[PDB]
Amino acid sequence: MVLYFIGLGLYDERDITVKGLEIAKKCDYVFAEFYTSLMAGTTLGRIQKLIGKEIRVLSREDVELNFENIVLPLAKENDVAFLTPGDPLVATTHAELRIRAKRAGVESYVIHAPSIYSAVGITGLHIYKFGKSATVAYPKGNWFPTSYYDVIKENAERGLHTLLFLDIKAEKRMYMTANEAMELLLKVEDMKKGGVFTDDTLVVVLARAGSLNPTIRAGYVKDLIREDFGDPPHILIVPGKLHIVEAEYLVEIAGAPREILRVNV
């Protein structure tokens, strides 16, 4: 009688850890949510096939409002698993679900999986140099979010890189592209005018991390803003001051302009 939070990883059903798979295979009931992120290289059927269990998919409302009514009751007399894309506790509010488990008298365990938060290491930028992270959210009605702009400014001022998670509307199947994120940032720049994000800003785009051939591109906004980075999901990164080795990798592997090799120490 336990509840497992198991990550499925970055792109396809094989991104789950062996540990996660062996445990999931022996669970009595398996639930999952696919609104926190997009696994562009698999399907529900393929995941169900690998795990050998029927997976009941829950919506954001089912989880946030009724996790304790849909999942926990069964976990009191059975072995239950809750699957999520990437790592179950990264850039989600799932951690709070463990408190609900505790209050319901259900023990919970966490099985990690590859997360975009660490996968950005494939961009060649030193992981320790990433500062505060942010999410570029779709404007709605008369509300235009801009907090992510201040995050970039604060990090850049310290010479730190900024990871920008991009918005997603799973039910409407809308996945923000790096292009849309850039357009939104240029608009915020025109408004706040802090010289934080302009056409001359160096940015890095990582699309479909986890696949064998993700798209990794670095360059100036003026050149990348209309570039096709392939299918979603996408992540946008605004580097801070670069180490020479970071620049070399962006040039050699991400096709960045050779001029960035000349860092301004």
Added chain:
Amino acid sequence: MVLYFIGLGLYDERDITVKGLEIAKKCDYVFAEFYTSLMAGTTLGRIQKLIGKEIRVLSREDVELNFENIVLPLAKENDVAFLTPGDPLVATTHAELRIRAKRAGVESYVIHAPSIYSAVGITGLHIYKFGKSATVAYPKGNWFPTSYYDVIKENAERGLHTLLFLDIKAEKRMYMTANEAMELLLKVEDMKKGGVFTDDTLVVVLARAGSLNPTIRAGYVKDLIREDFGDPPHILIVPGKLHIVEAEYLVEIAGAPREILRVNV
């Protein structure tokens, strides 16, 4: 003609992803390094048994100085795998190895796995609030490194959390404990008087992330500095101001004192 950088994950031999395992099994040659970090919950023998392949371990010199003489040659006419603890390319020196592969006319692909960088999400602390990361190094002789202290100060000053990787003697397989790390930080504080790390500082300890039974503890230095957190590896976190949700998770899941709900939020 192909080199695969495959992550082994967090703690034991089952932390590799299904993708990594299946690729590793089909490789003609398998190399590995255990100097960036160790896999405390398993052994080289258990890893070999799972992959069903003999594994040649490479030292830091083998990699940094002779990667192109030891690994790439075989990668020219065979499928070769390079196993690393955690997620590949999180360790700062690994990215460059992909440039070496390119230079040698060898294709390289990255198969991700869980990293402690993302696994800390299990502490209940929001991942976006983590700032710059640092490593607490053992002082030696006349050398007393303290840059990690400044990292904490700069992050906390901006309300950000600080992830502290603890020193390790890979060869001797000796791990710095969170207790030793706290002792060191108090020493640095007494030297800098920045008021950054004291007996009243709230800290979080995560031990054996990846294991089904990690130790997650939160509390003030004065109370945790002599506490037993179990077997290595240990990770130390100095959180910044907490969101009430983070505090409630630390209290309910990490046994933090109720006091944090009024002092650190």
